[PDB]
Amino acid sequence: MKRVLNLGNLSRIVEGDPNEITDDEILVIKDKIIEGKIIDIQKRVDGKLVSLITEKYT
Amino acid sequence: MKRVLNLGNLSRIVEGDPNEITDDEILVIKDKIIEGKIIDIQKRVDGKLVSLITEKYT
Amino acid sequence: WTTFVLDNNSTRVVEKVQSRLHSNALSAGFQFVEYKAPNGVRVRLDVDPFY
Amino acid sequence: YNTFSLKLLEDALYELSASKLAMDDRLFVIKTGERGAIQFHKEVLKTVSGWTTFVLDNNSTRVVEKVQSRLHSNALSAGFQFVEYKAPNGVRVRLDVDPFY
Amino acid sequence: YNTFSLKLLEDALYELSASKLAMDDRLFVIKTGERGAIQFHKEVLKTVSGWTTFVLDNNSTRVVEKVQSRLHSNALSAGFQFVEYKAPNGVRVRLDVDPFY
Amino acid sequence: MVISINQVRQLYVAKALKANTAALTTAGDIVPKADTAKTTLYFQSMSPAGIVASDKINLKHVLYAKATPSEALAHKLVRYSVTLDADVSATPVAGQNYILRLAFRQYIGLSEEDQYFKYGEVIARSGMTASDFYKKMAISLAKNLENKTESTPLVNIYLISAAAASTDVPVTSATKESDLTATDYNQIIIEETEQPWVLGMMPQAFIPFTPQFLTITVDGEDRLWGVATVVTPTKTVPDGHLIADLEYFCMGARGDIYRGMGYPNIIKTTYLVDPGAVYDVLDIHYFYTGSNESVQKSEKTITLVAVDDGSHTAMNALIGAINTASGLTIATL
Amino acid sequence: LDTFLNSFPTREFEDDNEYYWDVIGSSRRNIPLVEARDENGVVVAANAAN
Amino acid sequence: TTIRIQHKVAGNKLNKKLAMGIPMVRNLESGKQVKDTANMWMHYVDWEVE
Q1: Where are the transmembrane segments (chain H)?
Q2: Set of chain H residues whose Cβ sits within 8 Å of the Cβ of F113
Q3: Which of D2, F109, F157, F159 lies in disulfide reach of G26, CB 3.0 to 4.6 Å?
């Protein structure tokens, strides 16, 4: 057990508009219908804002 | 575009044992199949680990 | 400004105040009253009640 | 150039310096306008943005500062400018803005 | 080597120093070129980046420094370079850049 | 242009081949004359100021006589094919500055410590393709290299379309994207350039370079965005300028060395070669050994530069003449 | 612009005739290769053995 | 290990005086050409042989 990233790279975990998320920062999309849950973690790669969570099916 | 949470609560995002993380820590799990993905993010609710990301269905 | 980290030691958004209720009692609050843009441009603020 | 960068500039200055300048004489003073000085600030900023390893502290940087107002007891002043860079191996990059530009 | 690593270097220098050098004798000066000094800086950086259990603040390192100017009052300069490392048990690899290289 | 000599070198232009010493009317005309015993050889050339005879070649003191074509003297211009390394990404990254650095050696000075770097930058966007990226890179490169304010013609930038991988299209500081319509571009060629030439002052030199790429961040890691593959040269630099500097030098041995030193009081030499023609060469190396004690060899060479017409005519005839006159067996071009 | 041009010094001349100066350079050289040939004089292609 | 060098030279260079039409120059160990005021050309072969 140890920390996952230096706090410098964790201070750039933000909550905002997908259109203003550049690199050197990760995006979190909070859920509305559910209070504490999250919808997706996102990271831009080539202008597109892709997810870091692998899709899981039945 | 504020940080999703403060640093005292982001500092406690860690990587490792699911058994050793307290209620104050968020657990990350790096996907082993893919090289830069995530498979789950967990924090202790009632002594049990539960995914923060909302479950998706079709 | 995710590039930077705003710390209480400099900003003092949470000050320490003398009190009867505790030995380390705290006072919280802050306000931005001024901006300092590039190349000398400084923006102060002088509230007027006529407004 | 159609797009300015600190990579473009620091490579040019360094390749030239490794070729022609001794490590102790690589201080490059640049003349330009004040719109270029802002563009230098913006580029130096994003580079420092990617400096994730270090946590930049308002104590040392004093980006946000405390000023005396009457609207509050803890009144704050925000603002900074990047006016200089320091690349590896002796390269210093300063600015000298003239209005002629 | 195809890809220079400081991990391999600290291992080799320590193992060597153990079997052949006293703790008071494990200083290693490396003679290389300016481009190697940069490769060294890059790797030492990638290394401390893994020191997640630590927090590198600019207050102690002065990576970002405050310089006086006329364009502003909170004017800053940016830049650092890693030149040394210190592996356990007396190993301290220092650097030396030669123009002959 | 100053060169190295084996104690002497001479040059004679074969602008027309005659058959007698009585047909040397026009300047440049030449004939090879040899005994019927085949003990000596020499050339009767018609000078602008009359007629001359080259030194005599003792056919038993002949070291080597070889003919050289013009293709072997036309400097082949180095090309560099440039592309995107499909390892990092087969397409551009939508927020990364794709900088290219062409490092030049033997810029104005003579040495390799005379370094010089020109760049080309393209910040890429989302819907960008490889074709668009190559196009914009070429424009950025031309505006810095193929301009009209740079003292030197450093390189020649081109573009190739997969539809016609054989046709290369130029790109100058004046070229605009509207002139580049094809949507299938796959590489950027970067040649050398024929530098300025000045008879006896500025020898035919070049400035080679290496396209050195800069790093981009593709997946949070510094990786190079391209590869500079050398391809087979396509353009050449004809030898007219080399032969004229050789004549200018080799006509300072049997002639005036104060070519212009003291301007009104000179002797004006009338050089006979056209720097705009392609010549095919013949160099005969031979020596002179004296008598009993004087055994040391005074080595010599003389060059004959005739004109080429695609086929190597005007030298195969010259060669045949020398071969029948001196019995030597020289190879045709 | 006036201050700009005053950043530079002046050199007094004695004529309006063109003047020229000597430019010194560098010495150390590397010589480029044109071609290589086998023992038989045949040319050395790039996809060729040692 | 062993090495050898030589340099051939005609005899008319015995006291050859150069007409400084363009500055005559010396190569240096650094790699820089320095200009010299000498007019005798063997002053310039001594340097290069050493």
Answers
A1: none
A2: 31
A3: F109
